[PDB]
Amino acid sequence: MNFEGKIALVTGASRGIGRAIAETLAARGAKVIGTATSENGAQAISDYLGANGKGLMLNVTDPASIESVLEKIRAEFGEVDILVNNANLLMRMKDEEWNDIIETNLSSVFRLSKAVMRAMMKKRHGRIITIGSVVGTMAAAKAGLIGFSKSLAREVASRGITVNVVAPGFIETDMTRALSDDQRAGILAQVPAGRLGGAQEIANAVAFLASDEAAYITGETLHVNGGM
Amino acid sequence: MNFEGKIALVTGASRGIGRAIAETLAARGAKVIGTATSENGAQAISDYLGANGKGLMLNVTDPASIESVLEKIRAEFGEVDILVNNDNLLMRMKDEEWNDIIETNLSSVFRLSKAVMRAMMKKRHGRIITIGSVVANYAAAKAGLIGFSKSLAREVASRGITVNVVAPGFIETALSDDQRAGILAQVPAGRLGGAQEIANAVAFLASDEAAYITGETLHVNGGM
Amino acid sequence: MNFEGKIALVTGASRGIGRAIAETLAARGAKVIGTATSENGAQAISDYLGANGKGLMLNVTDPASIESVLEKIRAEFGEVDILVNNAGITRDNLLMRMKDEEWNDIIETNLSSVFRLSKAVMRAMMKKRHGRIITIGSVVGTGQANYAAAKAGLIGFSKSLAREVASRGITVNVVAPGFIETSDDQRAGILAQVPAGRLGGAQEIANAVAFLASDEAAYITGETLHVNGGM
Amino acid sequence: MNFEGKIALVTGASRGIGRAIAETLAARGAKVIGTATSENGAQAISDYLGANGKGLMLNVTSIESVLEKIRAEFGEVDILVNNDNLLMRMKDEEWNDIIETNLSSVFRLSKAVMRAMMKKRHGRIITIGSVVANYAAAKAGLIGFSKSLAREVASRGITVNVVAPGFIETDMTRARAGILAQVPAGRLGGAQEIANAVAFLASDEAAYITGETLHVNGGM
């Protein structure tokens, strides 16, 4: 219970890692706003957050949707103190697949971070944590994301804002449960720990970086992969 | 003269690093096609390349410009064997300027590499070298570029194509003694690098002498 | 008190980071054994740990000292569950000016010793299918080249060991502190190299160590956690 | 002949990578002194170097003796090129042997040749990493040492770099698809490919490259 009084915005909180993060921050006293791409999803999020938060529909690409969501949050809870971003053959993918991945996984983090920084710097306290993609098989967006975070971290560090990245490994999610046994085994073979990580393990790391315990940790990429 | 028979496409060959790279590859026997964002810039390139190449207009942002340039090069010289791809506070950038940077420094390398690969692979030989931006609003694109190259490198390594990145540091390209001193204080070497020094590194990676080097980022910055 | 029932061995717990780590683990329920190179040093540790632990003299350079200390701990508390290798205070110097004497002493104290200690405590960790080994990097001083080799070798050793013992429930990590509070014009020269604009507290390194030693970081291993304020 | 007038000391030049490096620098005009642990080794090296150099016996763990011999016959050294089980299984003995042979020796050699380089305000120190756990610390310590030394002597015109080879067809590799399956290039590298990289870093064309680890491993 070290987040009382803090407001956290967690994108993609429908399930898996996103939901574990939202429930963990909520269980530790934060008021949580989890987002989904549809209104039904948003309502599902509101149903599990109960009195500890609310779910809102958000399209991370649309700059209009971002402004809209932030306005609803300000009207009901206040300014966002914690932002948690939850997101083929490279010579055969179409320009669409390329732009979609850059837009969704890279540019959106830039637009959201930009939208919440003003309040954070004014209050001289803030946390921006981005969750990297979960290992699903045995790149430019992921690497660009880390480069952006290290750069932003340096820029806003003096104002009391930390910007970090949590890079999960082979974590137990729907996508990994939907893989075939041969596929799972191949990946698991690449994991020293010899087991898959739980969604809660990524959430524990996020909760740590979001707390006052890590005020001096910024521009860091924390890997939670059992040794991959 | 170890490039004899090879065709190299160097984007942004108007001056500085780009031109040093184009002149070095040409001096070592390659047929060089340097590009500029205008026909005027292109002619200037033709004039310094002479009998060793030609300058063409390339809008690395238009799929049609890319295809158009590659078609001209095929008619004249053949297939491309060597491809060489040549500020403000973050929270003060507008969506528009962030998009221009990603699209100009990241997506364009993806489009160009894609356009020249099929031929390289059929030929079982190729070189793709990207030059990083010469020293915060470029960090994302820059890091994405390196990530893209390492990933592409693994994908095409078995067909004899290497994909590398050369990351220059401070390169002489004016300032007051105080500004210059501030720069020198950041470089252990104590001087600025020359455009030719980046070109020497590129020439090395493009040669057969670097056939086993791929997915590497070669820093030429005096230990910065 | 999420460390209740766990025994932690913290080397170099006399002052600074080492002591903050020892007090933090103790405050969270662990039975702590902090070490010093002298007998008087160990007693000072014993005084501040009170009923939550004890201080023992240990010379990591001496394999006879290591087993001696581990025997005392096993006789009074039990098997070591958490091992924290705390680097001493570094006193900077230039590479091309350091003699075999210093070079050898830094390797021996900063690299080989971690190897010998980790080796000494691993079996008891494996039989329990649970263990934590955390090494603290040399804190950046006021140019720390003479510690650079040993530091990089240490990280390499940890990543490698992490990969070897991960399936047994043991995590091996490294915490790399930046500028820590331990003369104002020189002050500004240091601060200017830190984006956050301030020095870190010894407690901030201890918070990171406490996190990695807990059950919440069971899936974190072979990682180097930098606590340097963006430096 | 990019190296005309330069003197290069290459340790472990008996065969493989070491010899390829020695022959390449010699072929490009350098006066080369290759070393070995024995005399047949040193003599074997002098044989293949001919009028381009000489072989000397050198136990890197002797250094001042070798540097003195080179100093009397050729001059100061301008280019210096430095050339298995589970960890919980290692004994203190093996662990120390590895640290001395692969880490401390580079420190001692670099220290022995720096004064000269500094005085001449020009120098090259290249260390070849281990070809492909018990060597994990020495290798990583080596890179850390090089980056640190590189910053220290950069203003004096000396560059310190590391070349990290991947699976290079040697004698071990002669005895497979298992390691090949690890490398994207689908083939093993040649000893000459590591030598080309070393030759490049040792030349004037690489004066602004320092503290860098150049991997030559086929995308591995």
From Swiss-Prot, chain B:
Report which superkingdom the organism of origin falls in.
Answer: Bacteria
Disulfide bridges in this chain: none
**Residues binding substrate, per UniProt:** S133
In which pathway is this protein known to take part? Lipid metabolism; fatty acid biosynthesis
Q: Which CDD domains match?
A: BKR_SDR_c
**InterPro entries per the record?**
3oxo_ACP_reduc (IPR011284), NAD(P)-bd_dom_sf (IPR036291), Sc_DH/Rdtase_CS (IPR020904), SDR (IPR050259), SDR_fam (IPR002347)
* Residue ranges of coiled coil: none
Q: Does the keyword Ribonucleoprotein apply?
A: no
Keyword terms, alphabetized: Calcium, Fatty acid biosynthesis, Fatty acid metabolism, Lipid biosynthesis, Lipid metabolism, Metal-binding, NADP, Oxidoreductase
| Activity regulation details | Inhibited by cinnamic acid derivatives.
**UniProt-listed Pfam families:** adh_short_C2
Where along this sequence does the record place binding of NADP(+)? G12, A13, S14, R15, T37, N59, V60, N86, Y138, A139, A140, A141, K142, I171
Identify one Gene Ontology CC term for this UniProt entry: cytosol
Q: What does this protein do?
A: Catalyzes the NADPH-dependent reduction of beta-ketoacyl-ACP substrates to beta-hydroxyacyl-ACP products, the first reductive step in the elongation cycle of fatty acid biosynthesis.
Q: Which PANTHER family match?
A: 3-OXOACYL-(ACYL-CARRIER-PROTEIN) REDUCTASE (PTHR42879), 3-OXOACYL-[ACYL-CARRIER-PROTEIN] REDUCTASE FABG (PTHR42879:SF2)
Q: Report quaternary structure and partners.
A: Homotetramer.
Identification of the protein by name: 3-oxoacyl-[acyl-carrier-protein] reductase FabG
> Gene for this protein?
fabG
UniProtKB/Swiss-Prot annotation, chain C:
Q: Which positions in this protein are listed as binding NADP(+)?
A: G12, A13, S14, R15, T37, N59, V60, N86, Y147, A148, A149, A150, K151, I180
Give the pathway listed in the UniProt entry for this protein: Lipid metabolism; fatty acid biosynthesis
Active-site annotation:
Y147 (proton acceptor)
Q: Which residues bind Ca(2+) 1?
A: G50, G53
What pH dependence does Swiss-Prot or TrEMBL list here? Optimum pH is between 6.0 and 7.0.
Keywords attached to this Swiss-Prot or TrEMBL record, sorted alphabetically, are:
Calcium, Fatty acid biosynthesis, Fatty acid metabolism, Lipid biosynthesis, Lipid metabolism, Metal-binding, NADP, Oxidoreductase
Outcome (variant: Y147F):
Defect in the affinity for NADPH
Catalytically driven reaction(s)? a (3R)-hydroxyacyl-[ACP] + NADP(+) = a 3-oxoacyl-[ACP] + NADPH + H(+); 3-oxobutanoyl-[ACP] + NADPH + H(+) = (3R)-hydroxybutanoyl-[ACP] + NADP(+); 3-oxopentanoyl-[ACP] + NADPH + H(+) = (3R)-hydroxypentanoyl-[ACP] + NADP(+); 3-oxohexanoyl-[ACP] + NADPH + H(+) = (3R)-hydroxyhexanoyl-[ACP] + NADP(+)
In the record, the effect of K151A is given as: Defect in the affinity for NADPH
Question: Which residues take part in binding substrate?
Answer: S138
What GO molecular function annotation could you give as one example from this UniProt entry? oxidoreductase activity, acting on the CH-OH group of donors, NAD or NADP as acceptor
Note how its activity is modulated. Answer: Inhibited by cinnamic acid derivatives.
Q: What does the record give as EC number?
A: 1.1.1.100
List, in alphabetical order, the GO biological process terms annotated in this UniProt record: biotin biosynthetic process; fatty acid biosynthetic process; fatty acid elongation; lipid biosynthetic process
What are the annotated GO cellular component locations? cytosol
State where Ca(2+) 3 binds. Answer: E223, T224
Q: What class of enzyme is it?
A: oxidoreductase
Which Pfam families does the record cross-reference, listed alphabetically? Answer: adh_short_C2
Described function: Catalyzes the NADPH-dependent reduction of beta-ketoacyl-ACP substrates to beta-hydroxyacyl-ACP products, the first reductive step in the elongation cycle of fatty acid biosynthesis.
As a miscellaneous remark, the entry gives: Calcium ions stabilize the structure, and may inhibit FabG activity by obstructing access to the active site.
Q: Which family does it belong to?
A: Belongs to the short-chain dehydrogenases/reductases (SDR) family.
Q: Which PANTHER family match?
A: 3-OXOACYL-(ACYL-CARRIER-PROTEIN) REDUCTASE (PTHR42879), 3-OXOACYL-[ACYL-CARRIER-PROTEIN] REDUCTASE FABG (PTHR42879:SF2)
Q: How does it assemble?
A: Homotetramer.
According to UniProt, the name of this protein is 3-oxoacyl-[acyl-carrier-protein] reductase FabG
Identify the gene encoding this protein.
fabG
